[PDB]
């Protein structure tokens, strides 16, 4: 009678088995291995350029594949493509609805995506055969609000929505192909691994799931944080990644050991993290706190390497170019700041 | 060889900058409002009347040469902690709540909890709230016939009397005004509990009549901007 209780007890037994297995392969630690090496030192960074083209707060500020141009969107209804070398606005696009929460710059410099509280994803064009930009393809198959989008190739892009269901689209026709479900809370962000075969997704259910694009199933699931997962980024190597939550704690996870590596939390900060990403070599980890600062830590020594002041309001987006030559930040004060 | 690349970029920058300035003029010339509520309080009926005319349902109108864009979220999920942060620059939040649905399942307590969570927010702390009291005719119909009693769901209601500075409509029994003003000053108390010196609240009694209401929100945005301008100059 009531076999669902038996199912639940065997599920928690499997959970205990997983915990014991993870404890079995944790004889050593990481802080004892990173010793005997030289620290990074007190690095001092100076803001290089500032961009003044937005009216409302910037939200996504997606970088470019050519390491020279970038894209940005705000809550005013405008999508601005900037040139970082000459400090010039390459393009300005008016959107259908004012509210936007993410962009996705295509790796071919031809398309660019948007998305917000309108439950639709627009894909524009850049190789203008008539000069002006126009909506090239719309995607409407979700009920919840869009959170993040990352292009994969020239004709498909994976997005995450607020209805605990993410999907892969086929803009060549206009229909979705694969659907990933399993999260209880709305998925907040996603990050594509450099292998172009699998991607990590972070949600509000204090979890992070590793999905396979061609299979559609969930490979691994990590639960180490205690609050919402605001941002998630992938290590450039392909065997680890980092996550920044809403509890003043960022954590480094790996895929092979199936457990967390080290937490970069500190005592004197209580605010939350909104965006986090890695560097070219992965030695430094930049995270955007909610106390109007940006903290860069040593990814190995678990110590603060630098603090970046600036924006009076909260910083909402952080990005690093592919070549690792400069960094870009976007906050709620209508200011885009490129640092070197 | 960089002659052609520079001049075209410069003229494009100038043109798009002039265009974005001309459009920013219009963006600054208008206002934005966010309408929400506890649910099943008559949002369709009031949007048929207030607006007088797919997660983000928007309605644009204009009065006395100032424009307002009212945004509804009646096509979203139940959780409201992640997406509600996008409405930081909105000048007013129209919180329409039913005042007769207390029995049919403590919806008044739900609305009070929602108001308390909104008021003490980290980013919504600088946003005033416009409050409506829907279905006052249903209050009058339910207190006169004897459908339910507020005392069962509110013990301190027995130690409350109608204030003297009230505006009782002629031909109205004192119990209707008692219950309505009890709801009103409970909302006002839960609002003024924290306080910031930055935003305030404004109660209103409407939606019981199907008459005009655009004047109320207009005057509310007006004196809200007046109060924020007074606070900016420290003369408040």
């Amino acid at each position: 009678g009531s076999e669902l209780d038996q199912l639940r007890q065997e599920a928690e037994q499997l959970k205990n088995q997983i915990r014991d297995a993870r404890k079995a392969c944790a004889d050593a630690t990481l802080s004892q291995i990173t010793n005997n090496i030289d620290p990074v030192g007190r690095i001092q960074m100076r803001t290089r350029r500032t961009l003044r083209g937005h009216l409302a707060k910037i939200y996504a500020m997606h970088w470019g594949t050519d390491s020279r141009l970038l894209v940005s969107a705000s809550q005013d209804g405008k999508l601005i493509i900037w040139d970082s070398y000459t400090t010039n606005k390459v393009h300005a696009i008016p959107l259908r609805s004012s509210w936007v929460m993410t962009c996705a710059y295509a790796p071919s410099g031809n398309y660019v995506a948007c998305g917000g509280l309108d439950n639709i994803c627009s894909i524009y064009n850049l190789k203008t055969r008539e000069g002006n930009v126009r909506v090239s393809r719309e995607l409407a198959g979700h009920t919840g609000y869009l959170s993040c989008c990352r292009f994969l190739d020239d004709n498909q892009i994976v997005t995450s929505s607020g209805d605990t269901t993410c999907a892969l689209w086929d803009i060549e026709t206009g229909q979705q192909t694969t659907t990933f479900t399993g999260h209880t809370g709305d998925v907040m962000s996603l990050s594509l691994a450099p292998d172009t075969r699998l991607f990590v997704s972070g949600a509000c259910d204090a979890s992070a799931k590793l999905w396979d694009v061609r299979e559609g199933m969930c490979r691994q699931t990590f639960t180490g944080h205690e609050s919402d997962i605001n941002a998630i980024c992938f290590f450039p190597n392909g065997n680890a990644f980092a996550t920044g939550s809403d509890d003043a704690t960022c954590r480094l996870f790996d895929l092979r050991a199936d457990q967390e590596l080290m937490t970069y939390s500190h005592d004197n900060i209580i605010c939350g993290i909104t965006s986090v990403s890695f560097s070219k070599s992965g030695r430094l980890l930049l995270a955007g706190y909610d106390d109007f600062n940006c903290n860069v830590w040593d990814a190995l020594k678990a110590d603060r390497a630098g603090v970046l002041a600036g924006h009076d309001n909260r910083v909402s987006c952080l990005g690093v170019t592919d070549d690792g030559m400069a960094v870009a930040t976007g906050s709620w004060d209508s200011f885009l700041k490129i640092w070197n | 060889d960089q002659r052609n690349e520079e001049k075209a970029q410069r003229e494009a920058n100038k043109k798009i900058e002039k265009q974005l300035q001309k459009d920013k003029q219009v963006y600054r010339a208008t206002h934005r409002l966010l309408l929400l509520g506890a649910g099943e309080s008559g949002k369709s009926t009031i949007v048929k009347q207030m607006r007088i005319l797919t997660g983000i349902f928007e309605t644009k109108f204009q009065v006395d040469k100032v424009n307002f864009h009212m945004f509804d979220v009646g096509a979203q999920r139940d959780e409201r902690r992640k997406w509600i942060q996008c409405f930081n620059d909105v000048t007013a939040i129209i919180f329409v709540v039913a005042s007769s649905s207390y029995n049919m399942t403590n919806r008044l307590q739900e609305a009070l909890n929602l108001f308390k969570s909104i008021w003490n927010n980290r980013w919504l702390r600088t946003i005033s709230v416009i409050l409506f009291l829907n279905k006052q005719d249903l209050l009058a119909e339910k207190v006169l016939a004897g459908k339910s009693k507020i005392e069962d769901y509110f013990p301190e209601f027995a130690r409350y009397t109608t204030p003297e500075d009230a505006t009782p409509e002629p031909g109205e029994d004192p119990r209707v005004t008692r219950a309505k003003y009890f709801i009103r000053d409970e909302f006002l108390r839960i609002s003024t509990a924290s306080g910031d010196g930055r935003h305030y609240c404004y109660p209103h009694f409407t939606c019981s009549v199907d008459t005009e209401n655009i004047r109320r929100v207009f005057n509310d945005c007006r004196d809200i901007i007046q109060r924020m301008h007074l606070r900016q100059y420290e003369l408040l």
Partner: nanobody
Framework: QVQLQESGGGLVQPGGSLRLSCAASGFTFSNYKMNWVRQAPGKGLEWVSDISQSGASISYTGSVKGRFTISRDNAKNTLYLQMNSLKPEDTAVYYC?????????????????????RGQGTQVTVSS
């Protein structure tokens, strides 16, 4: 890994005293704002009570004012709820919830059956 458990429950006649103890694991109990929320068979979720970060602020709904009492404890990381003179309408299932963000007072866990910090619950039902 967040985890919540609760001890309590029974079929007692109207006019008794019941004690429920909610225990948490996987996070710092000395920083968040715990709360109790219940729902009756046939109705939606109903916010019951909350406890602040320290224990100075106490708020009860109208239906339970002055009858049921709560108190947290950071030593055992557990919060205790006490039903005194149980009314015949408290035949509901209870859940011990937790606000999503620390240091902030914004708390709403009455969402429809989807939450990451709501425990298993306990079906408290009075007798006849």
């Amino acid at each position: 890994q967040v985890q919540l458990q609760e001890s309590g429950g029974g079929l007692v006649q109207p006019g008794g005293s019941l004690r429920l103890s909610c225990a948490a694991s996987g996070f710092t109990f000395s920083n968040y704002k715990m709360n109790w929320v219940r729902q009756a068979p046939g109705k939606g979720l109903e916010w019951v009570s909350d406890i602040s970060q320290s224990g100075a602020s106490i708020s009860y709904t109208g239906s339970v004012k002055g009858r049921f009492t709560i108190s947290r404890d950071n030593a055992k990381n557990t919060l205790y709820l006490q039903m005194n003179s149980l009314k015949p309408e408290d035949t509901a299932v209870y859940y011990c919830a937790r606000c999503p963000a620390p240091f902030t007072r914004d708390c709403f866990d009455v969402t429809s059956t989807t939450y990451a910090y709501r425990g298993q619950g306990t079906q408290v039902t009075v007798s006849s």
